[PDB]
């Protein structure tokens, strides 16, 4: 979805 960097899962 989001184009941003995903953080800790």
């Amino acid at each position: 979805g989001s184009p941003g960097t995903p953080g800790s899962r």
């Epitope: 979805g1 989001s2 184009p3 941003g4 960097t5 995903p6 953080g7 800790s8 899962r9």
Partner: antibody, heavy 113, light 113 residues
């Protein structure tokens, strides 16, 4: 705190393969984030090369054609840049990053005979 | 690819005054989620790039609130109020909407003395 450090040869011959390693400390590369390679040419232009994600999936810059692979070893918290068939156009300072926020110190690679 | 353009290669500023650095994109950076994916970086001499602003207007950590990001669609501004001598370096925009991520050419901030 999370830190990243590039390592590898600083001199590569034309037409050969460039390989660099990013060693990540104090964070598991499988836990999250995108893990990028970005390079800076002489003259200071920046180019995003690609990333490997927390699941080992990739995305690369089409500018690099089919020359680039980014791979990882979760057991060592390392990820790797491989760039085939280099020319003098690949002379640059190579940075590994965690997303846009955390940067390595960069490592210079010169392509020359 | 999305083309990023920074019209001014450099900008002079008197300390204590404000400056605006411009960036333009070839396509709107607005995502359906309502965020606009434009990031700003500063690179000081002999250092790695530092994130200043993410998602057009959000201030990254370790940056004085003298720094702000604004804009919309294809036109963006990094504004620095109350410029200090230590602000010297090169400011780069980067779009983070589509792959490949792409950078503007940079604008060097020069302090007048």
């Amino acid at each position: 705190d999370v830190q990243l450090q590039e390592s590898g040869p600083g001199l590569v011959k034309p037409s050969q393969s460039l390989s660099l390693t990013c060693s990540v400390t104090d964070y598991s590369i499988t836990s999250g984030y995108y893990w990028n390679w970005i390079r800076q040419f002489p003259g200071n232009k920046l180019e995003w090369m690609g990333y490997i994600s927390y699941d080992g999936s990739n995305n690369y810059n089409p500018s690099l054609k089919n020359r680039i692979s980014i791979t990882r070893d979760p057991s060592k918290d390392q990820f790797f840049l491989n760039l085939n068939s280099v020319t003098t156009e690949d002379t640059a300072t190579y940075y590994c990053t965690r997303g846009s926020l955390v940067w390595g110190q960069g490592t210079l690679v010169t392509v020359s005979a | 690819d999305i083309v990023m353009t920074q019209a001014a290669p450099s900008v002079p500023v008197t300390p204590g005054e404000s400056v605006s650095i411009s960036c333009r994109s070839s396509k709107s950076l607005l995502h359906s989620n309502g965020n606009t994916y434009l990031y700003w970086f500063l690179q000081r001499p002999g250092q790695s790039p530092q994130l200043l602003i993410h998602r057009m207007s959000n201030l990254a950590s370790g940056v004085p609130d003298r720094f702000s990001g604004s804009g919309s669609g294809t036109a963006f501004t990094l504004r620095i109020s109350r410029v200090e001598a230590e602000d010297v370096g090169v400011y780069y925009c980067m779009q983070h909407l589509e792959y490949p991520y792409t950078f503007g050419g940079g604008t060097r901030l020069e302090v007048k003395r």
